[PDB]
Amino acid sequence: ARGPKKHLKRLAAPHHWLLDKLSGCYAPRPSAGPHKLRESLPLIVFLRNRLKYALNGREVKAILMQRHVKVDGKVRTDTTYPAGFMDVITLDATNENFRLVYDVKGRFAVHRITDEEASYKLGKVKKVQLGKKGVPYVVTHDGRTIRYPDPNIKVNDTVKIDLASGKITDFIKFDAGKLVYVTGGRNLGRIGTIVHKERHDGGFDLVHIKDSLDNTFVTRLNNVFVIGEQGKPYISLPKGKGIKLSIAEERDRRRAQQ
Amino acid sequence: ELTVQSERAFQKQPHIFNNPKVKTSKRTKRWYKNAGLGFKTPKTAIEGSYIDKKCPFTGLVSIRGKILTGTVVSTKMHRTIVIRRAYLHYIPKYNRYEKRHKNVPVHVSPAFRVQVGDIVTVGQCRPISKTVRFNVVKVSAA
């Protein structure tokens, strides 16, 4: 009531952060930023719970204030800054470069990338319109506004964003035979090529998708992120490559390496 | 359908201005739109003379949300009817069903003529009145 909430209890935090239910009543509430607080990862939980570079939030603040970490090339000395999908995170001490991509279990992965790849990111366009004085713009999935885009860029395409400038390098359209990333829903983390999309005028366009082992599935168009053509992706995929082995095959694979 | 101009105010479509200087055929500028979702705009809306601000075709409302179907049980209001949606409600203990119903007050345009017993399909709009949130988009029975 009476205004915006500022706390976030543990057991209400998103489950993919993997915060243990003991050791505290509260979870780090993500501050307002480029990503929605459910589909986000604060820098405190990334630096402490995923990389183990700190033991406390106090140590995460001590890391942040000497301007070590920067996210998408900007410094961001904020504890609960929402780092989201496709953000690059640079740790100049250790010269490390991460990209936030999902593993197939549905959680954010520690995906180390090279220094050439940290110079860009992909963004899914959410709307194209005309701003004031008739200047067109696009809005990517992390809320970046890019003026004077290519006229061929319609919605649900991916644009390659330069991250030194905010300029657009190239772009991938939306049709059949395109490599997609599922970000959202039950199938979160899977990679498959799009076979066809269902019109459904009035709400919730569906799209059918099959992975490399020929397992089909279907997803709403809200959760699909095109990442290239079949064969080459435009980014480096994490380990596993979005395959979704069943639990039978998973314990068989674990009993191989054990 | 005997006069248009019955009220104390001048009934007219907003921002549709007919220039008194010119003299053509096609007597007045009439704004109409297609409501979408495959519903056909009726010719009585396109060619008529009624004003009907809450019309889904000539008026300032938009259809978005649920599309429902009912049977007309009342026409005694002015430009408003009450439809009856009948459904079966399942009770899990006895493993069977029961007849239930709701009454939905819907707005009806003068493009459409309904009587009691007709089946209509209605489209959700913004709140029209205290109870009305739905608007007739196709009358296709008798």
Partner: protein
């Protein structure tokens, strides 16, 4: 008596309770937008006062033993630059930085002078800041102009190739 102050403009000799706000005497608000009903005495002098506050506007003949004999100097001099220029009756070019009043203090045998910081003083840094702002405006205006011109030639190229394909259409 009973310690209540006098408010100007009440125009009656008894007390009455007023809903008081900020920027109004006899009340200091403890919260933003807080108003408070306080009792206050009127502006008409009656026998009920304990103290009357008086100000001398024009000296008589004798010297009062408390009042016109002794002096208090004002506690601080002017601090803003044109305030100093009005205090000394200066002119625009005078280099006011030397007319600053310095108060000597001794904590010990040491003495030091602790003049104020002149405010709203012209300085090379303010001129650099103004030059930077006026430069940043023209730089953004020129940048937007080349972005618009490049997009317009892109549209011209696309429309030309669309017209060439439309030339391939229709025989």
């Amino acid at each position: 008596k009973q310690g209540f102050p006098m408010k100007q403009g009440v125009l009656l000799p008894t007390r009455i309770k007023l809903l008081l706000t900020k920027n109004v005497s006899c009340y200091r608000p403890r919260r933003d937008g807080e108003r408070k009903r306080k009792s206050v005495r009127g502006a008409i002098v009656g026998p009920d006062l304990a103290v009357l506050a008086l100000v001398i506007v024009k000296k008589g003949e004798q010297e009062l033993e408390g009042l016109t004999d002794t002096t208090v100097p004002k506690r601080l001099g002017p601090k803003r630059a044109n305030n100093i220029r009005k205090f000394f009756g200066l002119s625009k070019e005078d280099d006011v930085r030397d007319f600053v009043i310095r108060r000597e203090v001794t904590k010990g045998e040491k003495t030091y002078t602790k003049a104020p910081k002149i405010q709203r003083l012209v300085t090379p840094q303010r001129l650099q800041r103004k030059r930077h702002q006026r430069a940043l405006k023209v730089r953004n205006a020129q940048a937007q102009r080349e972005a618009a011109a490049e997009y317009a030639q892109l549209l011209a190229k696309r429309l030309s190739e669309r017209k060439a394909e439309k030339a391939e259409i229709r025989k």
